[PDB]
Structures are given as structure tokens and as C-alpha cells.
Symmetry: none
Subunit: 329 residues, 6 copies
Amino acid sequence: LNFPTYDGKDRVVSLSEKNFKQVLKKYDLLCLYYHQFQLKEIVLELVAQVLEHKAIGFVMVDAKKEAKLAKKLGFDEEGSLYILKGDRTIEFDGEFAADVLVEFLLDLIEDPVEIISSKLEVQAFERIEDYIKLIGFFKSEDSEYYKAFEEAAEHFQPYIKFFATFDKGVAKKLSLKMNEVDFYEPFMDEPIAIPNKPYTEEELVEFVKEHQRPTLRRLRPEEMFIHIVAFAEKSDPDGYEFLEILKQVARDNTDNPDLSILWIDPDDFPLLVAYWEKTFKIDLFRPQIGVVNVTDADSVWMEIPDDDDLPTAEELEDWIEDVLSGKIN
Amino acid sequence: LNFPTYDGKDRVVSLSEKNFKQVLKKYDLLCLYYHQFQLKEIVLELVAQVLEHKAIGFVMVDAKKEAKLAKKLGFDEEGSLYILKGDRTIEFDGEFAADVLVEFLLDLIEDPVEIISSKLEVQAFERIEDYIKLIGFFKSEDSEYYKAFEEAAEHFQPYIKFFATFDKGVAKKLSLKMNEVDFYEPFMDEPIAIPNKPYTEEELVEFVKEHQRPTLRRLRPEEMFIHIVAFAEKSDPDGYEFLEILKQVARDNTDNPDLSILWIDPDDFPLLVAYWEKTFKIDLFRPQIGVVNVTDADSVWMEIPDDDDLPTAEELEDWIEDVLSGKIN
Amino acid sequence: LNFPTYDGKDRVVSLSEKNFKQVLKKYDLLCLYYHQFQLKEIVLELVAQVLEHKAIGFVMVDAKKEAKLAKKLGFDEEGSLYILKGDRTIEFDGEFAADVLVEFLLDLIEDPVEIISSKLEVQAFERIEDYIKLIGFFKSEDSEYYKAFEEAAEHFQPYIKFFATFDKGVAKKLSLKMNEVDFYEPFMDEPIAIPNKPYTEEELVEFVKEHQRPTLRRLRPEEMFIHIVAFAEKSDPDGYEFLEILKQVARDNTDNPDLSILWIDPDDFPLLVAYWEKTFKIDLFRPQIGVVNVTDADSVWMEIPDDDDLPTAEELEDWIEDVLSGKIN
Amino acid sequence: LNFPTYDGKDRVVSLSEKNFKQVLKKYDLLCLYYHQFQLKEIVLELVAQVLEHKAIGFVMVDAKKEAKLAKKLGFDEEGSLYILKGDRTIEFDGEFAADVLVEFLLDLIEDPVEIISSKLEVQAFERIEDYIKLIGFFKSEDSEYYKAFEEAAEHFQPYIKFFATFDKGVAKKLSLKMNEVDFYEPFMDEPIAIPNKPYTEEELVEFVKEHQRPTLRRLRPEEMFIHIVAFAEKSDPDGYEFLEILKQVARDNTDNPDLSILWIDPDDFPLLVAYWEKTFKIDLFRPQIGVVNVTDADSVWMEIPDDDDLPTAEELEDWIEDVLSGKIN
Amino acid sequence: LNFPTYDGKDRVVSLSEKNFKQVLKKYDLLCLYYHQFQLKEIVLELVAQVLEHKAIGFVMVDAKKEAKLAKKLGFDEEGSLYILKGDRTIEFDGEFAADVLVEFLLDLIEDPVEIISSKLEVQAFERIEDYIKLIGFFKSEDSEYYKAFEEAAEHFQPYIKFFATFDKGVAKKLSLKMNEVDFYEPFMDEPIAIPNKPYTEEELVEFVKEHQRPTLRRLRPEEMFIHIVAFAEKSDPDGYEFLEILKQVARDNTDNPDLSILWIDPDDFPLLVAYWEKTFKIDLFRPQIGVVNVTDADSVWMEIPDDDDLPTAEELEDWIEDVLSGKIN
Amino acid sequence: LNFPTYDGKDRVVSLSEKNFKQVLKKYDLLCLYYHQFQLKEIVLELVAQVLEHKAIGFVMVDAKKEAKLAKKLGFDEEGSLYILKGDRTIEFDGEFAADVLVEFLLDLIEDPVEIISSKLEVQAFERIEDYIKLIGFFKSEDSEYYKAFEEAAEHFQPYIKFFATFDKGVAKKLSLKMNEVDFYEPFMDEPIAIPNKPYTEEELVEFVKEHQRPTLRRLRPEEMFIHIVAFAEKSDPDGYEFLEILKQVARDNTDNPDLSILWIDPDDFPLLVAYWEKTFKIDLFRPQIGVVNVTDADSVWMEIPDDDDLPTAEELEDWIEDVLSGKIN
Ligand SMILES: [Cl-]
Ligand SMILES: [Cl-]
Ligand SMILES: [Cl-]
Ligand SMILES: [Cl-]
Ligand SMILES: [Cl-]
Ligand SMILES: [Cl-]
Ligand SMILES: [Cl-]
Ligand SMILES: [Cl-]
Ligand SMILES: [Cl-]
Ligand SMILES: [Cl-]
Ligand SMILES: [Cl-]
Ligand SMILES: [Cl-]
Ligand SMILES: [Cl-]
Ligand SMILES: [Cl-]
Ligand SMILES: [Cl-]
Ligand SMILES: [Cl-]
Ligand SMILES: [Cl-]
Ligand SMILES: [Cl-]
Ligand SMILES: [Cl-]
Ligand SMILES: [Cl-]
Ligand SMILES: [Cl-]
Ligand SMILES: [Cl-]
Ligand SMILES: [Cl-]
Ligand SMILES: [Cl-]
Ligand SMILES: [Cl-]
Ligand SMILES: [Cl-]
Ligand SMILES: [Cl-]
Ligand SMILES: [Cl-]
Ligand SMILES: [Cl-]
Ligand SMILES: [Cl-]
Ligand SMILES: [Cl-]
Ligand SMILES: [Cl-]
Ligand SMILES: [Cl-]
Ligand SMILES: [Cl-]
Ligand SMILES: [Cl-]
Ligand SMILES: [Cl-]
Ligand SMILES: [Cl-]
Ligand SMILES: [Cl-]
Ligand SMILES: [Cl-]
Ligand SMILES: [Cl-]
Ligand SMILES: [Cl-]
Ligand SMILES: [Cl-]
Ligand SMILES: [Cl-]
Ligand SMILES: [Cl-]
Ligand SMILES: [Cl-]
Ligand SMILES: [Cl-]
Ligand SMILES: [Cl-]
Ligand SMILES: [Cl-]
Ligand SMILES: [Cl-]
Ligand SMILES: [Cl-]
Ligand SMILES: [Cl-]
Ligand SMILES: [Cl-]
Ligand SMILES: [Cl-]
Ligand SMILES: [Cl-]
Ligand SMILES: [Cl-]
Ligand SMILES: [Cl-]
Ligand SMILES: [Cl-]
Ligand SMILES: [Cl-]
Ligand SMILES: [Cl-]
Ligand SMILES: [Cl-]
Ligand SMILES: [Cl-]
Ligand SMILES: [Cl-]
Ligand SMILES: [Cl-]
Ligand SMILES: [Cl-]
Ligand SMILES: [Cl-]
Ligand SMILES: [Cl-]
Ligand SMILES: [Cl-]
Ligand SMILES: [Cl-]
Ligand SMILES: [Cl-]
Ligand SMILES: [Cl-]
Ligand SMILES: [Cl-]
Ligand SMILES: [Cl-]
Ligand SMILES: [Cl-]
Ligand SMILES: [Cl-]
């Protein structure tokens, strides 16, 4: 009923060789912790307790002990959590917290393609606009074209969402022809149809990698970790009004490939944004947009002194253009 | 740049008497931890480090030691975190996690009334529909009617959001007369104007307490902790389509006072929902709606076997009516 | 519109090493033909043409040439067709004919667990009685207990059909408790509940291997290749009446473990039964039951001279008992 | 013991004139192949080897050589197989495959009337519901009324099954009066008694030709080759549930003469259905129903996107009515 | 439209105990009158009528009756007006007149820190030179450094004006670094930066108390009540020219701590200056400067016989130096 | 030393006829009060006490008693205070308060022409810009042209300030020729030279009456009592910045005769502005500008919702133009 508390049972096992390959096929997902770190230990134990009847294994691989198995799997960063799913290895880069870890694993454990089989689900599909989506129409799950699409979906999981229908009426409402795949940029209503259908998996992966930096995109707690970053609380009328300005500049520079704004909602990342306030010396809980140096953590911020008089989209665009050309960094 | 890690400095001080009343006026907020609890200790230390230059004090009051001060402040639950703000005491009931705690404190530290002074902010105000809102039009901050509204806002902080304008043109767009206050239920576009303006604070608090259980409301990580609960992932086309059905039943029973649905998005509470799956023995990460016994944690769930054929709003309403009348518990 | 004819295009590729592991993950199924055999060549080419847009690869591995890859995969019988599905190897033992091969591959390519999500599907499930079935009730696809059941299903695919539901109402109609699995013998209405739920995969595989020889079972064109064999044309009133007698002896000796009758419908295997007529020197297109020596192909047949006076179930049972004890072989 | 393989002996003789009429009375059945066709050659040779001690002759008539004999017998389609039985000529239109050919010939070689002489056989007769049946009660084989019935049976062989009894007690259980004939439509329990008994052969043939297109009928591998076609796997709980819906619409429109649904089980025709998937661009291995143009191979399919929510019989009937009236083609 | 006249309604309530603490939090400001005084009664009633919809309470505490509450609040001078604001008590020492009282209360009721958020407001800030100002640059209202500054502002309210910005561009124009505070003496353009930023509240209060007696300062009707006093009508060319001489002597003795001139404009205090003319026996409505004994009200005045030949700044400075050394008193 | 309190002595005498004309020449000024009015009584008594050794008489003329003398002097409004100065009668229309009354009388009692005899006084003259000024250059006080100027000055006293010099060097710095008079509009640096010097008194009075409504003018407590009114606190950075915008619109429409803005500083009129807030239902203590109906007290106000983004002078001018043309009233 209330919140779970860790019961003391140690479920995070230590995985050796020979013991290795048995547990990879016992589970859907293998969670590997590569080696004062009682905080990460206890978060991992609580996630393992809460998910104990899911098809997820929790193991730890010591840097000095199972260096054999760590070399066998390619574990560079010590203190990092790696997820194995079949033949694939996923390094978790999100916040090492129980909520974020649970959400990440439950995203990874499901099939990479979500099937839409109802016309009433298409309206809901079209209104979900916060992430990159791909959707295709195939004859069935057995099709070689579905298989190529599913294999591409596995390559981007869980960061990019793939969808498919096998129904003519659903596909008609999505304006999809047979074996065609539409690509949806975030916060844009009109999809891009991938050229020269039907597609191999290499054709799908290459298209998605070209279009992986859209004009505006929303940070997620899973996928994270020169750089234009905008801060807007969607739950606040100020931040929401600013978000609508950012959406307007996104639809004006779909032609511009050198424009990629990362929108961070502070309500989605309250600890991270508060920590960044100490580094950037600015109030990031009111509307801001800046460019950050990846190395030196230097920053320059657009002047938004008055949240009752936010910049228009043209004023944002002019500041953006001065930054790419060279205003300051 | 990356995520904050706790540096070892102990900022959570132990607060005695005589030392007490000085620190209540040094800070905007006083965070009091009432007494194997290294998990809550380390979360509290990391929040204290991240917020160290905010006007927030972090203290701990031992149950056996400062039982004098604990009796002076009324600390019942040991292991609970209490927030002092001026004359007010707030027990934190959310998840004891760094993200949720930071967001709660930054919500509490700000002024309880958000001032809207721009017509472009009204459109954004009207689109924010996920929580109960109140908005009033007053002559200025000095008005006795604003003061009554601000004092009512302080009484419900941070669970219910209060807004005010001092501008005639903003108020005209909100259809607010002078000293009038509109009450917005979640997921309903049309506000309720509080009768017999101008209002005392007791008149505002009494109105809000009558209307505190609306037909549909969304759980928040701050405010939480017989009971109809619906589970819907808004980020998923299935969960979004179900959410739209729940919104439709909400607008059909605004007359019915015995109808209060609590919508929980599992993406907002991934640890809690996964833990509840073990208690309710049902997949709560796909659309579900049930009634839960507060004491015994018994539950009965509507049959939604096929997410490609969700119930219509009429079928939901009939199941709801059978539950209130007596179908099972 | 009419029947497909082979167009001349050679799609059955020759698979070498290094080229090997790429195509195993390009396809759902890999069809490997291990080396005057123009008949098997042309059947394989026509199946490859008809299924060319399914996720199925057709290759050939020469016994002398890719003896490296043939040793790598364990190909004993030359002239045999092996199906690779993930980590699994399936030797096709059925009739080398286009109909039987297509049906086998389309059975293998689908998910080994068929999900039942509708109460109207349970009635149809219960009426399907010609093969061994297993059905379980699990919380979701993510459950470790579903995963054990799915892994057991993969081990017996496509010879034994596995089913699952995630719905309480469906499970109630099947009389299934949570994580319980029911085992259905052919031509018996009442399932056997597998003891000591929840089950590991080794517990499921061991139960199924004990119960793999039921009292009566129907030969299939996929699964085939001391032995009591009964011949009955279900489409003929004579053969149907005899089939009903065989079903009656099956329900009388559920206790007897040394009783396993193989029913062959000649309309399902017209070429094979006609060929066996030349070996057994008896008309197998009218009701017959016999015991066949596996080595010497000797046989002894029950006297059924008059199909207007078929044996009763007691007369069949007495003949069966004389055969196990020792009447003749 | 295993499957037959063709031994090399050439039994398919070439038939000239003068040599012709001798072999027509040597055999029960004469199999005539009218002229890169090594596939049909080798299938015919294997059937001839397997059936070599049956009263069946296998000959080939070249289009250019014995054009005399081909004109004498009326051989239009080259590459077609014609069966001679007494005075009758049967063109085989099924799949040119060894299983289908063996089953066809063994159906044709037997007497066209199956005699039922046991009351226990009547129960089995009544449960066999998948094809059109006729059954009559006569005094004996010598009766002129049996002879008319037998001659009608020969005219429809092997596509329509004829049955007779000479026993009063059997006939009483079938509710047959002396010289009366009952006509059974597929999937309907209640027969139609042919009016104005006793019957001449022309009276029987004319009745059967009027009732040759029933409301629902199952395709057979023998008899095959505007058109409503339904696809349902009886071995699958989904396909079985759909089949039961099709049976329900059949019993609701026994009055409607313009309603004739052809049910194809894909497990009976796996190669043909897979080939049709490429022509109709739809998954025919899950429940579907469509109308197909005989000329252009155009098709329009009922929307069945969700096999957990199949159409009811009323929804099927409404779609059927829209198709006959004119929805699309 | 015209001037307000008192309507007769008695709003100045008498405040008892238990009734006390409720009204302190009902209002922003509590106006307490501590006990032939119909003049002060009627002024207080007119102010209470004019401000009746402001968050200001008007009460009276009788010296003999609520001597309990008067001892509880520390009311020494009878006939005095005390203002309560939160935890603070302010004795009004100005002229007991409706204009002065209204202006005082409206100064006290507002937030002690005025926020500057526009670059165009900085020019206006810099030109306002008649009073002591403090201005700081902080990250936000939530900052512990803003809180210390706000708490210091509350301690000096309304006599010393505090300002803050949260904007980098505004702060750059003010030459303010982060958490730095500048102190502006009256009639001097260049601020003093308070040393060793960031500041606690005790550090700010101690700095302001050292610098509370600047070289020249202008009397206000709020703040008033050995002593060098200068009289100059700024609205008169004579008085304005003299004021410019006084400003010039102020910039020449910023080093001299024993020099504090109080400038009184008679147009700001016409009743008080006219009354002082009877005590000092000199025309104070033309330029004068004198030193007044605080006890005995003795005075000695600089000889300014000819307002067409005012003293230069050097002549003023020499007279000032003779007075501090000892010329007369 | 402190503030004067009324001592009880009754100096406000009642003036009869025959007693009348003696006291008009005993005093410089005669203060006549024309008849529950204990407030005006006590203010008048305190002013009379404070000014008792000035050449000012304080009398009262009852409406019913000395109606003879009231008709002789032309006293319309009862409850009004009339000032006699020689042959002139001045009705006091200001706030009936001791400060305002003292300042008014001390303004009236002095000579209407202020003589400037020093070059250092000219700089101070030129910087005094808040009121209409006239300045002339004459040979001496004996000149007929000075006498005409002095007589015109007496006609406008004390509302319009007149100045004169008799010095060539002072006049050269003012750019004044002999007997020339310059007219200074408020807040404009450049004077208007009155045409066709030398002037009669009727020529001066007629010029001043044409130019008595300048583009911007500041309300005074003396002179007060369709109408554009602007509210700006000069002591506040917001109000000061707005005042500078109003000055800028004043210099852009010196051509426009139908533009006369009345600037009211609320710090100069705190009681009156607070009272007007109740009539105009707007916060007049922050920057506002409106047009007020003289009769109905209706008002329409420019939208200034955001004091961090005040209107520019062009936006003010456009709103002004819409008001004169007809936007609303
Ligand atoms: Cl895995
Ligand atoms: Cl956590
Ligand atoms: Cl899905
Ligand atoms: Cl689906
Ligand atoms: Cl599919
Ligand atoms: Cl499909
Ligand atoms: Cl692929
Ligand atoms: Cl995905
Ligand atoms: Cl298409
Ligand atoms: Cl960027
Ligand atoms: Cl970019
Ligand atoms: Cl902040
Ligand atoms: Cl704002
Ligand atoms: Cl506090
Ligand atoms: Cl945490
Ligand atoms: Cl605000
Ligand atoms: Cl605001
Ligand atoms: Cl305000
Ligand atoms: Cl306001
Ligand atoms: Cl209040
Ligand atoms: Cl709030
Ligand atoms: Cl109103
Ligand atoms: Cl509820
Ligand atoms: Cl409820
Ligand atoms: Cl689940
Ligand atoms: Cl779905
Ligand atoms: Cl594979
Ligand atoms: Cl074949
Ligand atoms: Cl399934
Ligand atoms: Cl399903
Ligand atoms: Cl599931
Ligand atoms: Cl589920
Ligand atoms: Cl497993
Ligand atoms: Cl299976
Ligand atoms: Cl259960
Ligand atoms: Cl056996
Ligand atoms: Cl056996
Ligand atoms: Cl028989
Ligand atoms: Cl023949
Ligand atoms: Cl074949
Ligand atoms: Cl027979
Ligand atoms: Cl018979
Ligand atoms: Cl007979
Ligand atoms: Cl007979
Ligand atoms: Cl006949
Ligand atoms: Cl027949
Ligand atoms: Cl009869
Ligand atoms: Cl048809
Ligand atoms: Cl039809
Ligand atoms: Cl398919
Ligand atoms: Cl207060
Ligand atoms: Cl007053
Ligand atoms: Cl402010
Ligand atoms: Cl501000
Ligand atoms: Cl702030
Ligand atoms: Cl800020
Ligand atoms: Cl502080
Ligand atoms: Cl202040
Ligand atoms: Cl700085
Ligand atoms: Cl002094
Ligand atoms: Cl001094
Ligand atoms: Cl006079
Ligand atoms: Cl007064
Ligand atoms: Cl003068
Ligand atoms: Cl002079
Ligand atoms: Cl003179
Ligand atoms: Cl002169
Ligand atoms: Cl004159
Ligand atoms: Cl004057
Ligand atoms: Cl001149
Ligand atoms: Cl005007
Ligand atoms: Cl005007
Ligand atoms: Cl106000
Ligand atoms: Cl401002």
C-alpha cells in the first residue's frame, strides 16, 4: 500500500564464468553492476526486490575478480550498470535512482515494436508528440519487412519508439502504404515517409541516424548523457508559454540542420537542474535558454529578465543565429 | 555537468531549544527529520548539499534527545520529515527520494500565489488542466481581498495552485470581475465562480474543502497518502486512449458527488506501481481501473482483457455504478 | 489465383562460414538442406519462391564442401532438412512435399505461446481436442513464470501447443489459478494441473516428457518418425464410428501407462498409408488396428472382417491386453 | 516403413489406338496425362508406383502424337490429367501433388454409393457434416429406384457423397420412408426430403444441381477450381471461434439463395493460401473473409483487425449484405 | 473626485487579548493607537476610512484598560501610534496628519525589497539620489543570500530603501557581481561595495548602521525625530542655488566622519519650519544653516544676510569647521 | 522642537462691518472662513497659532450672521476659505490641512515677482522646470513696464511664478532684451519670448491665459480643483522611468493644442490618490495614465500590466490619439 522498503534479502548475485551463459537465457534482461558505494548497492537491491518476479536478473561483476567476464562483455566504466538483452549490451546512463531504473528496465523488457490494431488508437498515437516515433504497415509479424523493422527497433531500444500495424484500415488512417514506414520528429504533426520502400534494416538504421538530432527534443531520464539547452516548466503558465515559443521556432527551422534545441523540464529532473544551477549560476526554474560548452562547462544565456514579457519566436531565432555564427561561449 | 554525488560534508545539523527560534527566521523553510536508516540519512544529506545556497535549513530532531522540541512541534510519526514554513507545519508524505524531495521543497519555498500579468500567459494558464486551480482578480497586493486569498493559498500549499492578476485586461480574458475568484476542477475547461464575492479567507478555505475531491484527478509525487484508482500511461497510445475515456466519464458525472477517480500514470510512479503489482496481482502498466479497500488492501478490477478494444465511457460508467451500489470488494 | 508453379529463380543459396552468422539474425528461420535429388531440390525451390517475403532463409550446405559448417551445426543425415530458429535446431522428418513443408515452417515461425485474451476464445480452446495442449495464467509477458513457460514452449515447438492468458476472467473460465499450468491429453476433456506451482522451465519440460505418450494420439504430417497403430477415416461413417470406439478405450485406460495408440487418418496421409498397404498386406483404408515391429516391420492385426459389426471397446481392450501380454508379433 | 521414393521403373505407358479399348476394361480407372514438366512426370510416376497393385492404369497421350486418341476423348487443356471410369471422363483439377492425387483416385475407384447397414453407423453418419450428403432407403441393390440413385451418384462422383440403406431399422432412425432420399446441406443438422418419391435419375440430378451452392461449404483438395471466401484455421482457437460464427450466419440465411460462402482452412491448403497471400496482400492465416473477382483477382476484405474481438454473426451478415448490394469490388 | 471627508463610521476597534493574535495575521499591518485628543482620533478615523480595503487594521489600546496588552507589546509613549508588521514594531514619529500617515503605511505595507528587472529602470535608479539606497544581485528570491538581504531590509523599513536584481544584464549595468551589494550615500553618484561578499544579515545590518549618518541627507516626513541643520527651498532659485552649495561641501568631506548635515526643505515641512521660526527667531524660509542644541534648543546660525551673494562651499566649510572645533552654541 | 499642538487660545475672530476695513489694511493677508465642522475649525486655529506673528489675520464670517459682509465680499461656497490680499480675493481650493494651508499663505504673502540679481542664481532658475515661469528684464522697479509685469503677476498669484531682473549681465545670460518677457512651459528648456515688447498688463495676462494649459504639468497642493491624468511616483525607479516617458511625449506634441496631461505624484497627494483608488478601481501607486470624465467620474485607463515593460513614448502617443479621437470614456 505505501512505499516499498528494502527487506534485507540479497538478490544481487555475483556472476562467474560457466554460470554466465545459463542466466542469459533464463532471463529477458540481465542487470550487471560493474563493481563507500553503499548508495548504488542499496538502490540496486531495492529495484531487485521490487522486480523479483519479473524476468530480470541482477548480478554484480567485480572489476578485479571477474575481470575475465568483464573483459568478455566489454565493461569500461567502473561503477556503471550494463543491461544485457539477448545479443545486445545497454549501458544505463540515467540517474542512479530507483524510479528511473525501474522505468528504464520495464521499457527495455518489452517488445521493441508496439502493435497498433485499432482505429481509436491512431488518434492517441497522433497526439503523442514528445518523442521521435517510427510507424510501419506490414502484412504480418512473419514478413521479412516486419523483421527488418523489428531488428532496427531493437538497435535503438528504448530511446526511439517503433510502432507497427498489420491492418489496412489503421494504415489508411495513418496514410501508410504496404511496407512503408513514416518517421515523426518531436512536436511536428506531419511525418516523413522513408524513401524507396520496402526497407532493409540497414536502410532504416541509416535513416534514423541521420534524423536523430531534431530541431527540438525533450530530455528523458533514461536516454541522457555546441549544445543549446532550454529550460521550461510545462506545469507553470510561464514555462508553458515559453515552451510554445520553442515549438514555434522548431517549425520555422525544419530546413536548418545545425539547429538542435534540448528542452529540459525541471519538474522531470529536479535534482539535476538544481545541481546545474550551482554550475551555471542562473535560475533554471524559470524560463531560460543557453548554449553550454561540453568540455569547460562555460555557458552563455539569453537575456530573459522579465517572464511577463518573454521573447517572441523571432527574437529567440535571432539570438540562436548569433550563437551559431559566434556571439559568445 | 553530470549527476551530483554526496561529498561527505554533514550539513544536517541537530537542532536544540534556544537554538530553535533563531533558525526559523534565518530560513524560508526548515526541514526537520524526526530521528539502519542510512538510506533516509543519505538522501537528506544529498538534498542538503544540492540546495545549500537556498534559504532552506536541514536539521534532525532525535526522538529521545530533543523530545522537548519534538513535543513543542507535534512530531507523531518517527522517521517522518516535517517542513516548517513560518507558522505552518507540513509533513512530507511523498517518496523519500532526492528528486521528489527537491521538487517538493522548491514548490513550498515560493510564494503561494503566482501572479499573471500578461495576456499571453492566460492562454497557457487555460491549457494547464491537470490540477485544481484557483485564480482571482484584485486591485493590488495591498488589498484586504488579496490578503484573504493569499492566506487561503498558504493553507493549501503546495497541493492546490493559486493564481492572481491585478490587471483589467488579463481579468477580462479570464472573465473575472473585481475581487472574484474562479475555481477550476482538473480536466474541465469551465471554471466555477465562488459565490458572494468579495471573500474572506474562511469563505475561500471552506469552498475549496467542499470541492477538494473532483471527479478525476491525477496523482502527484508530492501530495499523496472507497477508493477508485485508474492506471494509464499517457506516453503510450493505449494508456492515452484510456485516459481520454476517463476524461469523458469525468465530464458526464460532474453532478455525482460520490464519484472521485484517482488517475495514476505509472511513468510518474514506476517504483510504487511495480510494488503495487505484487499486492494487487494485476499488470498495472497497461490500462486498468479498480476499487481498493483502504484497510485490507483488497481489490476488484474492471475486466479490460483486450487493449485493442478498451471499454467505452458508458461501459466504464456502468462498472462504476455497480461498484458504488455493491458489485464486489 | 490457381496453383503456384516454380518460376526458375534460384533462391536456395549456398551458405559458407563468415557468411553464416549474418543470415541467422537476418531471418526468423533458416532452412538448411544438407546436400538425382532433383525432386527435393524442386520442392525446396517452390517453397522458397512461395515464402520469399516471409522472414525465412533457404540455404544448402554440401556434405563435402561446407563440411566445416555441417560439423559446426551437427548434420548427421544427408538429404535431410534442418531448421534453425535462434539457438535451436529442428530436423524436419515429415513428408518432403510442398504442402507439408509450408505448414511446418509457418508453424515454427510464430511465437511458441498463443495468447488467449477473450472469453469467447475459451469455448473454442476447450473444443480443440486433437493434440496435447498446455495453458497457463500469468500476470504478464514480463513475468519470470511466463518466461519459464515460454522457454519450455520453445523446447517442444511445434509438436506440442502452448497457450497462455493474462486475464483473470479468462483464467476463471479455464479454472486456472495464478501461475498455474493445466495439461490437456488428447481426446480427454479434463486437464491435469501441474503440481507445485509456480514452475521453473525444467519442472515444465520434465512434466511434459513424462506425459508425452498419451493413451490415444493423432498423427500429424509435421511431427512423425511395441507400436499400436489404428487406422480410421474420420470423413467416413465407418471410420468415424471406429474412432469413437478408440476414444472410448482411451478414457477407460488413463491409468494404464503401457497403452499408447497412434491413430492415423488415411485422408491425412494418403500416400503413406497406401505405401504401408504394400508392406502390411492389409487394406488400411477401412478400420484396422495392429501392432507393428519397429525393426522388422512385422505386424499382427485385429480381425475386423465386417465393418457393419465393428468391435466394441471391451473387445478392443481385450485384444490390446493380449498383445501386451504376448498374443503374437 | 518410411516414405516411398520413386524407384525408376517407368509404369506410365503411352496409349495408342487399338491398344486403347483393351485397357479401359482391364482397369477400374484409367489415368491419362495429356502430354520442363519433369515435376508432373515424377509425381505421376510415384503415384503409379505406390498404386501399382490397384486396378488403376497410368498412361500418357501426347498432344502431337496421339492427337487421334486425344480428339477421341476430348482433351482440351494440355498438361491436364483426365480420369476415365467406365463411360465417364473426370478432369483432375486439384493440386498436382502425390497426396492429393492418391486421395482423389482412391475416392473415385470405389462404388459411388456407400451402404449403411448398422444402427451404430447412423450416429456417425449424422455427425459427419462437412459436405453435401444424400441418403436413400431402397428394397435392395436390384431395385430400379436404387439403380436411378446409383446412376445419379456416378454423375457427381467424387464431389458429392451418396449413401443408401436397405434396412428398415436404419431407415427408421434416419426418418426415411421407402424409396425416399434425404439431402443434407453442409453444417445443417436437418435434411431436405426430395419431393415426389420415387425418383428417376434425372429427378435426382436436377435436385442436386439446384442445391449445389449451399450457404457455407468447405473447400476440398479434390473438387476445387461474385465469390465470398472465408479463411479459418479450425485447429486454432481463433480460427475455430470464427468458424462457429460462419456456421451461425449459415443457419440464418438458409432462405437467401444469393449467399454462398466458401470456407478455406489454410491447414488443408498451406501452399495455395500462402500463394494467395501474395496476390491478395493480406494475412490469410488468421481469420479473414473477403469477396474476390473471378477475372481480375481484385478483392475487398472485411475489417477484422483484432482477433480477440471477432465480428458477431450480425456484423458478418451486415458486411455480406453490403457486398451483394454493392459496397466495393 | 474631491477630497475625502470622514463619514462617521467607527472603524478604529478596541483590541483585547485573545482577540489579539487573530487580527495580527488577518492583516499585513496593525495600527495601534495607545489611548481632548479628538484631533488624533479624527485623523486616525479618516485614514482608516480611506484605507478600509487595504490589508491594514486600525485598533486602539487604552493605557488603563488593556494595560495587559500594552505591556505585552511594549508601549511607552502614550498618545503614540505603533505599527505592527509580522514580528516587528514600528513607532510612528512623523507629523500626526492624514497625508503623512497614509504615505507611511503604504510605504510599510509593501515588500521591503524592490526588484529591478529592466535595463531602462537602472537609469532611473541611478538618478534617484535623495536617500540612502542599497542594491544587490542575487540568483533568485530563493537564495540564502537574498534572504539575508531581505531580512536586513525588513530591519530598516521604511527608512532605508533596498533594491535587488536577479538579472545578469541589469547587474552588469550596475557593476554588481553575484551576491554583491552596493551602498549609495545620498547625493553621491558612486556607490560603496560592501566588503567580503557574500553577506549574512548581521554583516549587512552592521555595515548600514556604520554608514547611517552621511555627509548630507534630506529630512522625510516619515523618518524624523551636535545637530547641523540647513534650510533650502528647492523650488526657489535661491534655495536651489544654496542646495547646490551644500551638495558641493558634501562631496568634499566624504572623509570627515564628524560631518552630518540635515537638509530640510520648508516646502516639505511648512508647519514644522514655521513653528521652528518662533523657537529659533530666524527666517527659515530663505537659505540658512545652523547648529542646534538637542536639549536646550539653543542655536547659532551662519550669517547669510544677502541671498544674492550666498556663501561659497569653502566659506560654508570654514564655518562648519569653526562650529565643530568650538565657535559658539 | 517637536510638532506644534494647538494651545486653546481662540485667535480666529469674528469680523463685522465697520470693523472690516480696518483689519484689511492692518494685515498683508486676511483669511476668511465662511461659517460638526470641528475639523476645519481646529486646522484653522492651529494655522492661526503657528502664524500669529506673521502679517496675516484669521477671521470667520457666519453665513446667517454677517450675510451683509458675505454679500459684500461675494462668498458663494459655504465651508470655504477665502484669502483677501489688497483688492484681490482668492478662494483656497486645496486640501484643508495645516501643511497645505501654511504653504499656501506663505506663498501668497510674498511679493508676486521674485527678483534675480546674481548670475549664479540663473543656473538654478534654469534647472527649476516643474512649473510655468515668466521672467522679464526691466530698468528698475519704478519702470512702467515692470509695473505692468508686477500687476500681471498679482493676477495669477500664487499659481504661476513671475521673476524679474534689473541687471544687464543676468539678462544677457537669460537672453533677455530690455523690457522683454520670456515664458517657460513646464519640462521644456527653451522659453517662448512674448511678442511685440514692451507689454501692457492686458497683453501679459492674455498671453498667459492662452498658454495656461501646457502639454505636461505637475499638480500642486495649492492650485488644484476631457481630462488626461498620469500617476507617477518620482521617488520610485518605476515611476521615475514613466515620468521620463511622459516628458518625452510632451516634447513631441508642443504643436498639439488639444494635449494637456496632468501628472500627479502620489507621494505629493497620498490621501487624495488613495481616495481616488476607491473611485477609479485601479492601483494609482504604480504607473498609470487615464482619461477621467469631469461629471460622471467614469474613467478609462491605458493598459500598463507590467512595470518592467512600460510603454514607449510612441505607444503612449498612440493611446492618447485614440482617446481624443474616441476610443472610450
Ligand atoms: Cl537476456
Ligand atoms: Cl531512489
Ligand atoms: Cl504491442
Ligand atoms: Cl496490438
Ligand atoms: Cl501478425
Ligand atoms: Cl497480421
Ligand atoms: Cl533483418
Ligand atoms: Cl521502441
Ligand atoms: Cl499499399
Ligand atoms: Cl545544440
Ligand atoms: Cl544545434
Ligand atoms: Cl533558483
Ligand atoms: Cl510571469
Ligand atoms: Cl521558516
Ligand atoms: Cl534518490
Ligand atoms: Cl508570481
Ligand atoms: Cl507577474
Ligand atoms: Cl500589486
Ligand atoms: Cl497592482
Ligand atoms: Cl486574511
Ligand atoms: Cl499554490
Ligand atoms: Cl468588476
Ligand atoms: Cl474513490
Ligand atoms: Cl468515489
Ligand atoms: Cl507487469
Ligand atoms: Cl493495444
Ligand atoms: Cl534464426
Ligand atoms: Cl509437393
Ligand atoms: Cl498469440
Ligand atoms: Cl491475444
Ligand atoms: Cl503482457
Ligand atoms: Cl498483462
Ligand atoms: Cl526460464
Ligand atoms: Cl506451441
Ligand atoms: Cl489465484
Ligand atoms: Cl504402442
Ligand atoms: Cl503402448
Ligand atoms: Cl459398413
Ligand atoms: Cl475404366
Ligand atoms: Cl508431392
Ligand atoms: Cl458400401
Ligand atoms: Cl454395408
Ligand atoms: Cl441388396
Ligand atoms: Cl437388401
Ligand atoms: Cl437409372
Ligand atoms: Cl459418392
Ligand atoms: Cl415407407
Ligand atoms: Cl460467393
Ligand atoms: Cl453468394
Ligand atoms: Cl502472413
Ligand atoms: Cl501584521
Ligand atoms: Cl490632516
Ligand atoms: Cl518589486
Ligand atoms: Cl520586478
Ligand atoms: Cl526569483
Ligand atoms: Cl530569478
Ligand atoms: Cl537571514
Ligand atoms: Cl525598503
Ligand atoms: Cl559575478
Ligand atoms: Cl550634525
Ligand atoms: Cl556632524
Ligand atoms: Cl490685505
Ligand atoms: Cl493637518
Ligand atoms: Cl525678490
Ligand atoms: Cl534680488
Ligand atoms: Cl529697482
Ligand atoms: Cl534697478
Ligand atoms: Cl499696469
Ligand atoms: Cl508669483
Ligand atoms: Cl536690449
Ligand atoms: Cl486633458
Ligand atoms: Cl488634452
Ligand atoms: Cl493599491
Ligand atoms: Cl518594475
